[PDB]
């Protein structure tokens, strides 16, 4: 299970690896990489100015889909 | 008992109800935890707190050995 890097830009645009995603498309895009393997490590990176509301919305979408192995990258 | 670390929108910081800064946070935390690094830390922040600030706090805890972290939304 190669880890997946989820990036959030300062304008709140979002990426799974290189793939642009939205809240509505994130889990479908992620499942293509993980093949549904919920034990896949997800690394979250974000621009310095990304706010906690945005972080936690992303976190909750992952959480509700069963993606619980999360590492924050600074 | 779990410890609640709060960050406000002006970036002021609290452990429980106790104001802390980056330089005083670990001493304040150790008073609550008696040094038990397995103590659960719940992080809460106002919506506008930014990722740089979050990760600064996370890194101070991390380097002190506090690794049981839950983010509260």
């Amino acid at each position: 299970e190669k880890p997946v890097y989820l990036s959030v830009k300062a304008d709140n645009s979002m990426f799974i690896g290189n793939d642009p995603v939205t809240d509505e498309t994130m889990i479908t895009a992620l499942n293509a990489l993980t093949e549904g393997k919920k034990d896949t490590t997800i690394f979250f990176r974000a621009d310095k100015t990304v706010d906690y509301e945005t972080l936690m919305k992303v976190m909750d979408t992952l959480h509700q889909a069963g993606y619980l192995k999360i590492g924050l990258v600074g | 008992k779990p410890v609640y670390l709060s960050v406000k929108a002006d970036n002021s910081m609290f452990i429980g109800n106790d104001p802390v800064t980056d330089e005083t946070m670990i001493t304040a935390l150790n008073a609550l935890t008696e040094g038990k690094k397995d103590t659960t830390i719940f992080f809460r922040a106002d919506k506008t707190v930014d990722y740089e600030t979050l990760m600064k706090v996370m890194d101070t805890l991390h380097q002190a050995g506090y690794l049981k972290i839950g983010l509260v939304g």
């Binding site: 690394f43 590492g71 | 719940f42 996370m58 972290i69 983010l71 509260v72 939304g73």
Partner: peptide, 9 residues
């Protein structure tokens, strides 16, 4: 509600 996180660097 909590989301457990590791920090990695």
């Amino acid at each position: 509600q909590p989301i457990s996180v590791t920090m990695v660097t």
